[PDB]
Amino acid sequence: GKYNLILSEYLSFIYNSQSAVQIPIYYSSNSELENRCIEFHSKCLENSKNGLSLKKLFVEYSDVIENATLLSILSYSYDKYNAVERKLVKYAKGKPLEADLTVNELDYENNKITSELFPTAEEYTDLLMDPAILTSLSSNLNAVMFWLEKHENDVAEKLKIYKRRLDLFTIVASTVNKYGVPRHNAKYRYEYEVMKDKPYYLVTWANSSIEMLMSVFSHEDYLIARELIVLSYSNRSTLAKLVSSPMSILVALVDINGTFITNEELELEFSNKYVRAIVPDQTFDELKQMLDNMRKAGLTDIPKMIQDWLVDCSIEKFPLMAKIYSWSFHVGFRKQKMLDAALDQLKTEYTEDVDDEMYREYTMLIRDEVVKMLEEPVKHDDHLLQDSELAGLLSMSSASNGESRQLKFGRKTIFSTKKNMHVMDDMANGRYTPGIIPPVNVDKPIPLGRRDVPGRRTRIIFILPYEYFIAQHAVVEKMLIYAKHTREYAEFYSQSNQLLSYGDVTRFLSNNSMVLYTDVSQWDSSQHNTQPFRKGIIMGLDMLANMTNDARVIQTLNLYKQTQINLMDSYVQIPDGNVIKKIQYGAVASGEKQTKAANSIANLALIKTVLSRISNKYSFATKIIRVDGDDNYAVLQFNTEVTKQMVQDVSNDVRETYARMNTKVKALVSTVGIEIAKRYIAGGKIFFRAGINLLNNEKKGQSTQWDQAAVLYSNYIVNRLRGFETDREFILTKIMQMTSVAITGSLRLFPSERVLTTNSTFKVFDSEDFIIEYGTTDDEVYIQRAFMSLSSQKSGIADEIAASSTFKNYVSRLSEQLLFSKNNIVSRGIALTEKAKLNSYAPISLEKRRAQISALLTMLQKPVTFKSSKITINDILRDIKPFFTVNEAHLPIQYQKFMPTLPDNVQYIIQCIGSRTYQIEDDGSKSAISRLISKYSVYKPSIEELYKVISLHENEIQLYLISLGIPKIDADTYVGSKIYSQDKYRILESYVYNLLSINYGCYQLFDFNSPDLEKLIRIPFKGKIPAVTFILHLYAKLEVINHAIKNGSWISLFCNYPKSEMIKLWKKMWNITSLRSPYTNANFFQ
Amino acid sequence: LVSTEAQIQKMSQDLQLEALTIQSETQFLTGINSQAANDCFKTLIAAMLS
């Protein structure tokens, strides 16, 4: 309940001119008070129009400002020019930074003046520096300066925080003021004209530095931030890698004194096992070399901190190491040229001097894995393999982006990259030939996208024609079905939907065991991803062809084999100025349907071969092998306790055996912990890097500034949970900057706290960190209803596309492939489903989003005169709130701390009620209807759509299922079985869990079925209304958990809900009309 | 007369009416009021007298 005050103070700060006026708008559910609100708003508008002060009106309508709820603030300012520089000159007292132009290997990566890199405006490109975020550097400077003004007169540790941040911002502000604040355009891009005489990386460096300095609280924070901010001005390439390198060894220096053990996808059983860390001298030499590299780059504080920690190598002081690791990733992205990044990726030294025996065994293992994955569906004539083309057509929405093509629908021309629209266009023009896989050779080389992650090297992505996806979809789906129940495939293994996000490596860690872990992210152009890998897959397909008598399955396998054959001899396109390089590339890359599963298969085969060779010199049992995306790790158990020499010998043997196959591996062997891309374990504890950048983005998103503010808050929450706390006031300042909309060049509307924190499509953040927003008061229900009224919007582009003959022809072909002939009713439902699937196209979704935002803005400019009987979640909670009695309770701490970087209050919740055991899926995946849908298409209807559908008539449900692509017989079986009667409860559970973010943020870490938690909830059971009991119990759990989060203490809840109230609420529980913005989903794991 | 509300509640409690089930017991509550009781009393005595 602080956002509105901070907003008003920020408006005063940024519009300190004497002509600046803030007009606060209010709303109320009470008609008597709403009339006063309307009169107050009218009088404020009239006074501003006549230019009269509004102070007296705050006395005339002091009840409105008291009893009504603030809806927004209208700001009128007329002196906006050169305001940020006027504020900044105060903080530019320090010495500006001078870039070292001999730090980066590539010339254009040195932070020199833009003219020195792009002599003419035609040569200029901001792609190598673009923050790719819809917020300006001027806004970041304004937010930092507002924070400094607000906290200028703090005392105690607050004053120390202010002083540290003032020093860091003095650095940043002096550097920026030396050249002047560059001005963004409407697209938040920085043009050549405003960047000629500035350092090229000034804007992105300034954004990263502002984030870092606003993330500083302690002295160690200040030292790390100062070092990184000063060094990243000159270093743009190797700084993050330099700082993150030691961690891969540090995890191996901490003994385990008790640890966690994964059971099923989030369930941990805890061990009191003690394991000593066995570290050979070579590892210490490597760590010494890493620290020497740090110092050679100008680092003094970070290596000194690491050396100080190395005195004891204790897990209690390891949080500083985790802090350095997380901070390393906030020096921004490395958006080097596609040519250099690709050439780094496809830098290969292929040799004929490889071990033929090893390669033949590896190929045989790949063949065996493919056969194991696809034997049963191939032998039994699985429907998906019989209708592979139809399955691919139905699942096109889940395909990767193609290369942009000029499509025409009706009389409109578009430039979609969506493969479904490409299929539509080709069908309309007689170019749809699934049976032919286009070559990807020097005649039609593959265009390349890029995936960039801070610290990590850039990855190339194939952009293939849609025929590859059509050919590969069904086979890869069968592969994923197999891999979901295979524990070795960490990326895919899951009992229902959730992955082993904590990993499974600590179960077999012992004093007779060692864990070998290897980074394999650089094995895209390795010699083992060449002909051997593709030919192993081809041999598997050839074997599978003999196991089936269905011509359609054989044709599916033939098309998959043809895709592999074509990809064996493939070329890639890379632009370079005015010349396109066609580079031979017969290796693996993402952007193909099978890439993830195929990489897992190949890595498993390769590690099996390597371990087979390593068994020559040592006797051990391989306990587990896990291939988790960019990393692999295997646990080897020995008949003796592990010694230093054993660890060193195993590491050397693994490296040499991988080299025998021409694979360059840095084989890291430990006894106590590992470090992989998505987590690292040290001292029996698990850590996740908190490197999500806030003021910089990898690439320009297809969202709005509103949704980007929501994503900014979500990223801030995820970073905070992982141990990287940015000041919440700075985040709220950014939120108010990004959610404001210009009614005119002089008038700007700032939404209030209620607007932004309310559960709706417009939700951006929560008033309290880690607590889902809900409220039982009349105003909150009223505004939720009003916002729900604005959710439904149309798209003109979607309408024109759906009305075009191209879309109608596509729907007709889809229907005839679905065994319907001029049905006239089924076809219309299929057309609706395909029009919905068109929502993945960025212009359509953006048009809908902007329509919603515009409607919201029109509503916000006036007091909300909207009333409806529509039921929202706040209505349910208001109904059930009065019957809950609250008492003070106590829970002892009886659960282990396994995530040391969790915030203290979240950690308290975990210690008191425990961590999540098993997760109820948020999409209703384990409902009969959802399983039926997944049987034919990977398209996932939103849980809201399923919630609406499951309460319709039987024929309506049947028609919806047929539209999704389920055959009529199966849909009629589902409906006539009356299975929807049981399915509606699972659907309601998933719907409510989605609305209340039970599977997001900190809630995903909690156990909502904890015996300790349910010991605090006392709801006498009344049967035969499961929906009401479910919502009552979930609400009680949320209330208790949120109270503990906010206060750090516990409350018991008691609700003797009357039966009549239960029956009344039962009717409403199936008519809930509520939404929550997906942009507010804070996924702790990513 | 016994309170019509109290007697109706007692009859509902004795009959154990189930919302999800169609029952004959529900119709037992038809036309239970004090005016009907007085109507019956007067009708019986007056008809016997006349």
């Binding site: 309460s951 319709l952 | 529900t26 119709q27 509550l29 038809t30 036309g31």
Partner: peptide, 15 residues
Amino acid sequence: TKEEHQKEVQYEILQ
């Protein structure tokens, strides 16, 4: 709506 359609029936439980 389905419940709304069912309301259209002219049955009263107690006559």
